[PDB]
Design a protein around this ligand. Structure first.
Ligand SMILES: CCCCCCCCCCCCCCCCCC(=O)OP(=O)(O)OC[C@H]1O[C@@H](n2cnc3c(N)ncnc32)[C@H](O)[C@@H]1O
Ligand SMILES: [Mg+2]
Length: 567
């Protein structure tokens, strides 16, 4: 299997060798199975959709993929690879929402096609025509006869051929289209397997959105890469009842599942003890965490809440990666049993130094060891010189999982993908800050979001964590720490959601004072302003990631859903 150059060849081969084995089973509610596909049916479905796409002149073109989580998305995604169509997966349109985000992806990709379901086509086709013109083709793929796969013309695919555009979340700016080659997919899939060590016998469950990163390349392609079986549920199923993820792990004897850090909090907070007694997670061998800061307290609370259910803390698999690196860059615990943690000086971190306290401490979790034949260096993002050990800088990645660049963004591509340092060339600039320690990669934050106030560096996620716990009225996961210019000086500004139960009785003065005291004590900052906003109103990506630049923009233009303000 490791001699396959691309996923079309590999799926066709698994469709022959394991024709009758279920590849995906979808639980639409997160509990009851509602649909399934074998390797045989997945491949036949891909060819039928591919042939439909080729007849519709989509080969070489970009096509939006607009699907609910489910098996129609997967077929349509593999249909694009089979057909030679540059797939652009995206979150589907929702009722009552504008198509601004999707129109902007269509504009940036210069896509002439949207692949979707019959139900969605009937609701969105005429709106898409209004936005995109008669030339734009909205195609439904869920009623294609499987007989049509006989007309499929296999393209001559090489690894360097572009496979799909992976749009970034939009956390720090507008989603940029990452050009993922067929070879990026194969190479990274091998990276994921070198670290996960899954086999044909593995069993996975994933609730992650299938549209991007972990849920796509990890949740869809990796089961296929290794010949395994993957159970799938929609994200909303888990967010509404976190029990269902761990219950799925229990019922199917899942070996490999994972989620961002917040999902582990959600299980530990929302799953009752009697539910815990229903669980046997002794089979859960690899519990990966990525897409967000990995928090030591989060790991410990999960391991302690579910120890009686047989979850072992050594199952935790920290990992780091991005769209620009296809997916995984680093992972694992090395030779340690548990995720490696360091206790370092907090003020050193604010000074780009990793060292013990000589002053307060922060506990940092490693995001794993760099997998395989790739290279990671820590580079000063301004002087473009390599850091020595104990120094924090921008994480630079060189390797064959590094994507081809950004779609139709030659300037930014040259800037971010042609990283030179010392005698080195060809490095990807991740835009993440971090450092190497003990063979592991630690990530401290995003360069673009870094707060530089009063001569010191501050990580926004550290301050937001301080603001959330400062008062019961404030919603966890729904705040932003941003810096604004006050007469030529950067100053802290807080945009923070309040709980709905607290939105009618809110004491702005008292709550703001609680926030000021917590920031003063933990960070030695004084906020210029605290903006209290309605629950659900903070600008987020479709994936839920806070758009910190947009909170600052909305604070500066008065367009936030304000409920209170202190200044
Ligand atoms: C039966 C067999 C089944 C088998 C299933 C197989 C599953 C395998 C897939 C699991 C591998 C996921 C590897 C992690 C990628 C993250 C995605 C992403 O994050 O992609 P992206 O949208 O581009 O966001 C980019 C920005 O997210 C920030 N970030 C990411 N990881 C961070 C961290 N560990 N710590 C701190 N920050 C972090 C960071 O800032 C980054 O630059
Ligand atoms: Mg990014």
């Amino acid at each position: 299997v490791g001699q396959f150059a691309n996923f079309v060849d590999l799926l066709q081969y698994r469709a022959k060798l394991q024709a009758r084995k279920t590849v995906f089973s979808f639980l639409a509610d997160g509990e009851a199975e509602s649909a399934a596909l074998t390797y045989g049916e997945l491949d036949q479905k891909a060819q039928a959709i591919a042939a439909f796409l080729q007849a519709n002149q989509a080969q070489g073109q970009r096509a939006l993929l607009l699907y609910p989580p489910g098996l129609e998305f997967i077929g349509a995604f593999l249909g694009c690879l089979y057909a030679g169509v540059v797939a652009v997966p995206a979150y589907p349109p929702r009722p009552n929402k504008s198509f601004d985000r999707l129109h902007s992806i269509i504009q940036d990709a210069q896509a002439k096609f949207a692949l979707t379901t019959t139900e969605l086509k009937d609701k969105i086709a005429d709106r898409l025509e209004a936005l995109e013109g008669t030339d734009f083709h909205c195609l439904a793929t869920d009623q294609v006869e499987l007989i049509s796969g006989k007309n499929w013309q296999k393209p001559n695919i090489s690894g360097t051929d572009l496979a799909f555009l992976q749009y970034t979340s939009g956390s720090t700016g507008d989603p940029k289209g990452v050009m993922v080659s067929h070879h990026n997919l194969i190479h990274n899939s091998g990276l994921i397997n070198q670290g996960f060590q899954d086999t044909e016998a593995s069993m996975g469950v994933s609730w992650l959105p299938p549209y991007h990163d972990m849920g796509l390349i990890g949740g869809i392609l990796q089961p296929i890469y290794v010949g395994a079986t993957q159970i799938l549920m929609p994200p909303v199923a888990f967010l509404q009842r976190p029990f269902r993820w761990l219950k799925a792990i229990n019922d199917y004897r899942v070996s490999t599942s994972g989620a961002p850090n917040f999902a582990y909090d959600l299980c530990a907070s929302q799953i009752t003890p009697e539910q815990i007694r229903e669980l046997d997670l002794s089979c859960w061998r690899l519990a990966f965490s990525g897409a967000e800061p990995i928090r030591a307290v989060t790991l410990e609370n999960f391991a302690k809440t579910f120890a009686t259910a047989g979850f072992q803390k050594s199952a935790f698999y920290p990992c780091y990666g991005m769209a620009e690196t296809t997916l995984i860059v680093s992972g694992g615990n090395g030779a340690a049993q548990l995720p490696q943690e360091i206790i370092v000086s907090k003020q050193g971190i604010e000074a780009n130094q990793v060292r013990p306290a000589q002053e307060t401490t922060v506990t940092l979790v490693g995001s794993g060891e760099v997998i395989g034949d790739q290279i990671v260096k820590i580079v000063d993002p301004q002087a473009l010189t390599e850091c020595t050990v104990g120094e924090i800088g921008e994480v630079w990645v060189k390797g064959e999982s590094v994507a081809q660049g950004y779609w139709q963004k030659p300037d930014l591509t040259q800037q971010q993908f042609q990283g030179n340092v010392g005698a080195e060339t060809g490095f990807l600039r991740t835009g993440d800050l971090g450092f190497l320690q003990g063979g592991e990669l630690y990530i401290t934050g995003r360069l673009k979001d870094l707060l530089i106030i009063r001569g010191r560096n501050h990580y926004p996620q550290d301050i937001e964590l301080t603001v959330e716990v400062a008062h019961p009225a404030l919603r966890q996961g729904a705040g932003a720490a941003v810096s604004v210019d006050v007469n030529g000086e950067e100053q802290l500004v807080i945009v923070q959601e309040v709980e709905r139960k607290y939105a009618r009785k809110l004491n702005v003065a008292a709550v703001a004072q609680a926030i000021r005291g917590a920031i003063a004590a933990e960070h030695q900052l004084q906020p210029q302003a605290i903006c209290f906003i309605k629950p659900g109103s903070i600008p987020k990506t479709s994936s839920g990631k806070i758009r910190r630049h947009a909170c600052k923009a909305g604070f500066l233009d008065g367009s936030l859903a304000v409920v209170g303000e202190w200044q």
